[PDB]
Design a protein around this nucleic acid. Sequence first.
DNA 1: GGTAGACGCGGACATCAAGCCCGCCGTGAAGGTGATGACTG
Length: 97
Amino acid sequence: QELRQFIESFIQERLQGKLDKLQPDEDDKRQTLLATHRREAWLADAARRVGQLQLVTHTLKPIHPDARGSNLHSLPQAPGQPGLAGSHELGDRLVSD
DNA sequence: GGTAGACGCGGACATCAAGCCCGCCGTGAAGGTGATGACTG
């Protein structure tokens, strides 16, 4: 099981990336809490903040600024006529934002 | 207020050297989201 170093580089990499965030006036709880909950509570943050998002292929955020709606998640079908192809006959190398 | 019926050929067209430097190019506004935090009727 040599695939936990990704969890190490996700936890300690972000914890060491907070080295420029240095405030010598009021960091006396922020630095300690960041070092504590940046590793152990990071799974809790990635569980509670894993349910705000979704995979998409028909997003509506790119058509209005704050249009809170429902985005599609499935590819369109095949068009039954000859001579016009688009966002359904695209390849299997797709990427869901 | 007259038709009439025609307009040429040949030949040739310059070479040389050169084309700048210096400084500079503006600022302001154009982020949504939960998550408590304060208010609360």
